Design a protein around this ligand. Structure first.
Ligand SMILES: Cc1cc2nc3c(=O)[nH]c(=O)nc-3n(C[C@H](O)[C@H](O)[C@H](O)COP(=O)(O)OP(=O)(O)OC[C@H]3O[C@@H](n4cnc5c(N)ncnc54)[C@H](O)[C@@H]3O)c2cc1C
Ligand code: XAX
Ligand SMILES: O=C(O)c1ccccc1O
Ligand code: FES
Ligand code: FES
Ligand SMILES: [Ca+2]
Lengths: 1225, 67, 30
């Protein structure tokens, strides 16, 4: 009794007879229509990997329009008579690439490639609306698109070349969906069924259903109704039907602002400001005005502005019609509006501003919670005619309570007062009082939020006043780049499903530390297509897993973090597995939990004892020092945010325990080992294949196996192929991240700035198993010197054992942590001594031939030339002057500049992992297939390996090919890690080539003018084998702690970065203005790959140090589980000027063709933004705080807007502006 | 498979046991040459021991063989 | 050392059970 759903994809008609309202367009494209170019990266609207173009008729506005949307939030039931275009839709390597696809690929804009299709579709959509866009439009187009690899620079450079009706009924398994064609039909429907839920854009509802497990068994979509879509210019303001997209609201209001007089458009420009950095295009194209309003989020950016301005709401039910201005009574409680259950919001009139009426809007440049504690506001003042005397005042704030509120007491007291200093004082006092937060108020950041309520008003108060009075060495693009841009590159979940293939959903601990009392599955057993539930009892081999045999495959008697895997559900579709998992009832008995580093130090909960490197005589160095500074420092962790999350397919053959797996991993050997150990089967039975990863970053070196083992078990149990791909929220919760570090330190120095003694005790938060924590701590200790000679030095480290997901490798592997701790105390030495930072860093540098604190010698120490050249090209000394000039001429905005070096040790710190295998075949057509132990994750290792094989063999690259990595071609491989993959695999590929060349030598002698093909065929026919292994092992490695000698590293990669920032001292926001990097990568095999690596790495570092903040409940539950609450760098995050140079004339005698590892060494240079920011904070504190020029103030990482703001101590932070006593002129 | 062993003659002429027998034997010998130093250090050890030790000493445990 | 021993075909038990995979026994993609 349901109507047929009919739409179009890439021009082809789709007729769906049994359309289920719960089906997203992304699930239908990938799993019904076999178009896998469009990706899942989050499922929540933040990342854009799932972008498509939608095309539909506005009957009203009378035209076919083209917009971008997130496929992951679009229900197919909204798509009746809509046309969809995917990346497959605009071109292909099979036919011919669209110019967009080709350009992103040739410009080096694609590394891993997983983001590239979403991005191609964002750019494609812009070009169909505007065939000649500006650079601003291009940039805005990419707002809702995230990339983890590239640093964005190349995509923008690349694309800059372009610049300058009857009711329908659908019936699902749970949901009945009605598409309403008329207003009348809506009201009747709402009257027959008051509980029925409206859905328009689905960008809120979709999240409630997916993430918060709500189920609305009746949905009415009223998007077709003309009255819900009208735009009407009236004499009071501009009315918008409640279904109007935010993009349409924005279009109209911008048209009104350019046309009408300034004085009429104050409200309008408020709405526009709130809409600026609001999601991206894909969301604004689908999100309705009315949906935002009725959602009534405490952190709605719109509702404070509508409340402040008395925006009119026309509200309707069958019979009833009424218009009210939005005021404080509109939101009576949490997520509620003053509407009756029958009632629906019809339109919204956004008023013109009057004479003597002024408006501002502001929002907090940070969000850390799903729906609370992000400050946002609309402010309105109306004066008596021609005067400065207050007649009306409205200050309405989100994120200061569980609903949008208005500061009524405060504003009331201002009536008839004049707009002056006293007024400012009275309002700030009102505000601090009326909006006061108890110290344990949900959301935290109490100080920062109070200070923002007041600083926002100060901006309004100042604004109102103003209103009155051989290819080696060649820039070869990634070999997969084109197919990555075309959506043709295969990633693990792009592999077709077998007819009998099943799906797995992890079942996860909701408690930090607890006994498992019972597990009940009877409600999961009722989900359609449930196959089975798996737990510890089902394992045929061993439940003992992990790098140090201290983990369970499945939890047994207790759980030890939130996300501790307990079991798994297997079902016939992934939605079925997802549903049935959320319904598995687990009964717990809480145990005492240990969460923070501090919790752990106080309870002595550690893995092992302290590690230590010590050299010199500390109680003596401190004797000789003129100056001794002690302190404590914290650095928060980081999520990998690989655009492709964890994924495994396991295929049980049914013979002799055989299993073939396809997996998103850096470590095929351990995946194989772990799978076999769990199964109780020899390693020779198990085959693991890796084509590519859509990102790794250290996060798929070991923790990939959490999914793999589980999936393989389901494959063993059921005997069907099984697969699982993690959602983003699962991925961030279970798989662990970068290690948070705590440091307590003490430096002894002279008045010159010469260091003479250092001790640092480092503590990492290692989480609920060992994993790579110990080696991570070792690498931290090897780097606590950065580039500096320290005669007397003691570094300890301790691994904190905690009820958190087990943390793991992350690009840098403990290095960034200790290098940051190191740049910190260096910064305090320069300030304390009253000398320029760059003079202090310079004087304390190692020289050629110096020995580290672990006694390794530094030969080819290139930091001096990197430094000298970075100073020169960045015009450092001139710009420094200009920063001082800026800071003397500006009160509430400050600039900051910093230049900082890096040294990063190259090799695995466990000697045995510095080995590598290759396997080379030459077929009788001369075509060569290379296989080696490395995996491709976007860093372009295969491209480099192709380039090396080609040089070595003296044949064009076109004759060489690499397909994939597999455990049956090269066994016992180390993980693709520690930046050495190009060194060690290149060497082994090189040896295999040499072996093949020596074998062809005699056929070469017999026919010196012969082609390669002739020689190969002559050697085949003479029965000379054309297949060989190659092998390499890094010589002279083996550091000893007990003797503190022998080489920990093969060589060191060096670099230097300069960064300039401007902070907003009233809000803690900042802009990255300019960064110059000079990097020593020896002689590069591929300048483009290597510059790509410097850039991507630098921007992952600037994330770590400034933007990325993970946040947990006191009970240890991760709160930031997606792009909405966790902020990785975005297109608009990178420095306006971003220059990277590779040092000329510096070959490396240690590695393949004089090249140097580049993957991880440049990530630390990201910290130049942090220390530039801190430099800006110093000037802000010299401005408003005190007069001590040598003041050491602590600043932890990440320097978010909260920490930057709270550190700009002033009359607001202190509350002196209220008339109180505090600290500040 | 063609990605493990390439350019193979068809399984024919009754010679397979003969020629692949020799090719398997030769590869087995190369392994034993590589494992001999670890045998001599620990004559009372197991197969498993010699293998782990060779791996940890970064000796390749993969080889081709040919006849 | 089994050379010269009448050891049964290694795959013979799976062949008798239906378990030994022949080309058409490989499952089809959807
Ligand atoms: C990635 C992303 C970023 C975002 N960023 C921001 C941001 O920065 N600032 C901000 O304020 N918001 C932000 N949002 C929230 C977003 O603006 C809202 O989700 C959106 O406006 C809701 O409209 P919709 O049409 O999708 O509503 P739906 O999800 O379809 O419905 C939302 C709710 O409104 C009800 N409803 C809808 N229309 C009516 C009607 N006319 N009458 C009565 N009830 C109705 C529905 O029943 C439902 O309860 C963001 C959302 C996403 C996904
Ligand atoms: N685009 C892209 N670039 C990337 C990676 C990625 O996933 N995607 N990851 C890093 C890491 S993190 Mo680690 O030591 O396992 S902590 S080392 C490492 C490095 C591994 O690649 P080689 O340079 O050895 O070939 O690649 C870097 N560059
Ligand atoms: O020393 C390293 O950099 C390292 C990296 C990955 C795994 C183990 C290790 O010792
Ligand atoms: S997957 Fe749709 S926005 Fe991330
Ligand atoms: S290339 Fe953009 S996420 Fe990897
Ligand atoms: Ca750990």
């Amino acid at each position: 009794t349901a109507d047929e759903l009919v739409f179009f994809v890439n021009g082809k008609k789709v007729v769906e007879k049994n359309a289920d309202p719960e089906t997203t367009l992304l699930a239908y494209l990938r799993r019904k229509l076999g178009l896998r170019g469009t990706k899942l990266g989050c499922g929540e609207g933040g990342c854009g990997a799932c972008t498509v173009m939608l095309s539909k008729y506005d009957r009203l506005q009378d035209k076919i329009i083209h917009f971008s949307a997130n496929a992951c939030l679009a229900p197919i039931c909204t798509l009746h008579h809509v046309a969809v275009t995917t990346v497959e839709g605009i071109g292909s390597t099979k036919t011919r690439l669209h110019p967009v696809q080709e350009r992103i690929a040739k410009s080096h804009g694609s590394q891993c490639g997983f983001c590239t299709p979403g991005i191609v579709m964002s750019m494609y959509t812009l070009l169909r609306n505007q065939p000649e866009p500006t650079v601003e439009e291009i940039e805005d187009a990419f707002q809702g698109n995230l990339c983890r690899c590239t640093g964005y620079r190349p995509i923008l450079q690349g694309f800059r070349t372009f610049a300058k009706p009857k009711q329908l009924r659908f019936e699902g398994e749970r949901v009945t969906w009605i598409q309403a064609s008329t207003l009348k039909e809506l009201l009747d429907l709402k009257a027959q069924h008051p509980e029925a839920k409206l859905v328009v854009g689905n960008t809120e509802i979709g999240i409630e259903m997916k993430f918060k497990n709500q189920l609305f068994p009746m949905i009415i979509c009223p998007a077709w109704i003309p009255e819900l879509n009208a735009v009407e210019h009236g004499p009071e303001g501009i009315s918008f039907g409640a279904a109007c997209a935010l993009s349409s609201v924005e279009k109209t209001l911008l048209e009104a602002v350019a046309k009408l007089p300034t004085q009429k458009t104050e409200v309008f420009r408020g709405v526009l400001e709130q809409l600026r950095w609001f999601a991206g295009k894909q969301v604004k194209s689908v999100a309705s005005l009315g949906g935002n309003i009725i959602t009534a989020s405490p952190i709605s950016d719109l509702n404070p502005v509508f409340m402040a301005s008395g925006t009119k709401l026309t509200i309707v039910s069958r019979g009833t019609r009424r218009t009210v201005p939005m005021d404080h009574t509109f939101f009576p409680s949490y997520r509620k509006t003053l509407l009756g259950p029958e009632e629906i919001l019809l339109s919204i009139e956004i008023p013109y501003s009057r004479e003597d009426e002024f408006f501002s809007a502001f929002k907090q440049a940070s969000r850390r919670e799903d729906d609370i504690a992000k400050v946002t506001c609309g402010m309105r003042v109306l004066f008596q005619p021609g005067s400065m005397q207050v007649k009306e005042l409205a200050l309405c704030y989100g994120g200061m309570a569980d609903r949008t509120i208005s500061a009524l007491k405060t504003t009331q007291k201002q009536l008839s007062k004049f707009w002056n200093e006293k007024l400012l004082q009275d309002v700030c006092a009102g505000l601090a009082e009326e909006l006061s937060l108890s110290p344990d108020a949900p959301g935290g950041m109490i100080e920062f939020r109070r200070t923002l309520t007041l600083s926002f008003f100060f901006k309004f108060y100042l604004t109102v006043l103003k209103k009155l009075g051989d290819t080696v060495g060649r820039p070869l693009p990634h070999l997969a780049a084109a197919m990555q841009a075309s959506g043709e590159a295969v990633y693990c979940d792009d592999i077709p499903r077998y007819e009998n293939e099943l799906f797995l959903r992890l079942v996860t601990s909701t408690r930090a530390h607890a006994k498992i009392k019972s597990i009940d599955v009877s409600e999961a057993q009722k989900v359609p297509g449930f196959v089975c539930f798996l737990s510890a009892d089902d394992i045929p081999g061993s439940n003992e897993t992990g790098l140090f045999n201290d983990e369970t495959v499945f939890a047994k008697d207790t759980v030890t973090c939130v996300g501790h895997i307990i079991g798994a559900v297997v079902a016939d579709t992934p939605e079925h597995a997802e549903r049935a998992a959320h319904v598995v009832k687990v009964t717990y008995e809480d145990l005492p939990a240990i969460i923070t580093i501090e919790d752990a130090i106080k309870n002595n909960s550690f893995y092992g004892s302290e590690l230590k490197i010590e050299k010199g005589d500390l109680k003596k160095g401190f004797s000789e020092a003129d100056n001794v500074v002690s302190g404590e420092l914290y650095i928060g962790g980081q999520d990998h945010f690989y655009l492709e999350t964890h994924c495994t397919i396991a295929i049980p053959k049914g013979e002799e325990g055989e299993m073939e797996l396809f997996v998103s991993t850096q470590n095929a050997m351990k995946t194989q080992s772990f799978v076999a150990k769990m199964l109780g089967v020899p390693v020779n039975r198990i085959l693991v294949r890796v084509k590519r990863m859509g990102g790794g970053f250290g996060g798929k070196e070991t923790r990939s196996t959490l999914v793999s083992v589980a999936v393989a078990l389901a494959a063993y149990k059921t005997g069907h192929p099984v697969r699982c791909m993690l959602d983003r929220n699962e991925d961030m919760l279970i798989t662990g991240g970068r290690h948070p570090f705590l440091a307590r330190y003490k430096v002894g120095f002279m008045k010159t700035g010469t260091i003479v003694a250092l001790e640092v005790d480092h503590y990492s938060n290692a989480g609920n198993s060992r994993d790579l924590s110990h080696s991570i701590m070792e690498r931290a200790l090897f780097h606590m010197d950065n580039c500096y000679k320290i005669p007397n030095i003691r570094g300890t480290g301790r691994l904190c054992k905690t009820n958190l997901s087990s943390n793991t490798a992350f690009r840098g592997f403990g290095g960034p942590q200790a290098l940051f701790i190191a740049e910190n105390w260096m910064s305090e030495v320069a300030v304390t001594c009253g000398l320029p930072a760059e003079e202090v860093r310079w004087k304390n540098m190692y020289k050629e031939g110096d020995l580290t604190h672990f006694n390794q010698r530094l030969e080819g120490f290139s930091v001096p030339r990197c430094w000298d050249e970075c100073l020169k090209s960045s015009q450092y000394y001139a710009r420094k002057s200009e920063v001082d000039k800026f800071n003397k001429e500006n009160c509430w905005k400050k600039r900051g500049l910093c230049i900082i070096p890096t040294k990063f040790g190259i090799s695995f710190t466990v000697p045995f992992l510095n080995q590598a295998g290759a396997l080379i075949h030459v077929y009788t057509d001369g075509s060569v297939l290379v296989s080696h132990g490395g995996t491709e994750m976007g860093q372009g290792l295969h491209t480099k390996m192709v380039q090396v094989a080609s040089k070595a063999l003296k044949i064009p690259i076109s004759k060489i090919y690499i397909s994939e990595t597999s455990t049956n071609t090269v066994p016992n491989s180390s993980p693709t890690a520690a930046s050495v993959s190009t060194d060690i695999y290149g060497q082994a590929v090189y040896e295999a080539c040499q072996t093949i060349l020596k074998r062809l030598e005699p056929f070469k002698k017999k026919n010196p003018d012969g082609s390669w093909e002739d020689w190969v065929m002559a050697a085949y026919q003479d029965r000379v084998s054309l297949s060989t292994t190659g092998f390499y092992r890094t010589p002279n490695l083996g550091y000893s702690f007990e003797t503190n000698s022998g080489n920990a590293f093969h060589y060191f990669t060096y670099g230097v970065a300069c960064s300039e920032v401007e902070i907003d001292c009233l809000t803690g926001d900042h802009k990255n203005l300019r960064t110059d990097i000079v990097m020593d990568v020896g002689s590069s095999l591929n300048p483009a790959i290597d510059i790509g690596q410097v850039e991507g790495a630098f921007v992952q570092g600037l994330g770590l140090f400034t933007l990325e903040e993970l946040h947990y409940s006191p009970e240890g539950s991760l709160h930031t589980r997606g792009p909405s609450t966790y902020k990785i760098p975005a297109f608009g995050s990178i420095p306006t000027e971003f220059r990277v140079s590779l040092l000329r004339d510096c070959p490396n005698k240690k590695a393949i063709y004089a090249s140097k590892a580049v993957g991880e060494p440049p990530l630390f240079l990201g910290a130049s933004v942090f220390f530039a920011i801190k430099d800006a904070i110093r000037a802000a504190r010299a401005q408003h705080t005190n007069n001590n020029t040598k003041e050491l103030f602590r600043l932890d990482s990440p320097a978010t807007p909260e920490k930057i703001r709270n550190a700009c101590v002033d009359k607001f932070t202190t509350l002196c502006v209220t008339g109180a006593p505090g600290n500040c002129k």
